[PDB]
Amino acid sequence: EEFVSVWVRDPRIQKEDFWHSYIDYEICIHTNSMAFTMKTSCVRRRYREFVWLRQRLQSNALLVQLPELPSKNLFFNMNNRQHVDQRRQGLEDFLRKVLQNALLLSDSSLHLFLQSHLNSEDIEACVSGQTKYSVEEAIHKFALMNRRFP
């Protein structure tokens, strides 16, 4: 009886004592679908990475209508709670809907985004055949790192 759930939670500042601080969120997937490699995952990503994802998806799916992202950074201010809640909600909604689409669901880009440590650049490398390691290997390796597996 297939299901997929997604939560965006836990807004946290990164590189706070640097110039170039940013915010990121935890993305938690729970699913029983054959579509995913891992039935659970928690991963941390920033808005600019959602933006990358959205555009990568659109580019491989000419005619799909991608859901919206929330307020661009330019109009975001972490000192305003409302901004950080809205950004989180909007990012949850974006993924919820994306996940509802079978065609998108078959994009390994979405999968490494959700169930791996890999950044934009390495995702593109990996799914474009250019890496030592497969998509599965990356996701598995992430899981082990992330669950501190012995």
Q: Which residues bind a copy of itself (CB under 8 A)?
A: 7, 9-10, 26, 28, 30, 32, 37-40, 42, 136, 140, 143-144, 147, 149-150
Chosen residue from 8, 29, 57, 91 binding Na ion by CB under 5 A: 29
Residue 26 touches which of Na ion, a copy of itself, none (CB < 5 to 8 A by kind)?
a copy of itself
32, 47, 80, 103, 110 from 106: Cα distances, Å: 16, 22, 37, 5, 8
Residue 35 beta carbon to a copy of itself: minimum distance, rounded to whole angstroms:
13
Q: CA-CA distance, 148 to 150, in Å (whole number)?
A: 6
User: Is residue 46 part of an annotated ligand binding site?
Assistant: yes
Residue closer to a copy of itself, measured from CB, 3 or 18 = 3
Residue 147 beta carbon to a copy of itself: minimum distance, rounded to whole angstroms:
6
Q: Give the range of 12-20, 36-44, 49-57, 72-80 binding Na ion by CB under 5 A.
A: 36-44
Question: Rounded to 5 degrees, what are φ and ψ at 31?
Answer: -155, 160
Q: CA-CA distance, 96 to 4, in Å (whole number)?
A: 8
Task: Specify the 3-state DSSP secondary structure of 132.
Answer: coil
User: Is residue 72 part of an annotated ligand binding site?
Assistant: yes
The per-residue DSSP string of 39-86 comes to SEEEEEE-HHHHHHHHHHHHHH-TT--PPPP---GGG--TTSHHHHHH
Output the CA angle 111-116-122, nearest 5 degrees: 90
Residue 22 touches which of Na ion, a copy of itself, none (CB < 5 to 8 A by kind)?
none
Query: Residues forming the annotated binding site?
Result: 46, 72, 87
Q: Where do contacts with Na ion occur on this chain (CB under 5 A)?
A: 5-6, 27, 29, 36-37, 41, 43, 96, 111, 114-115, 130
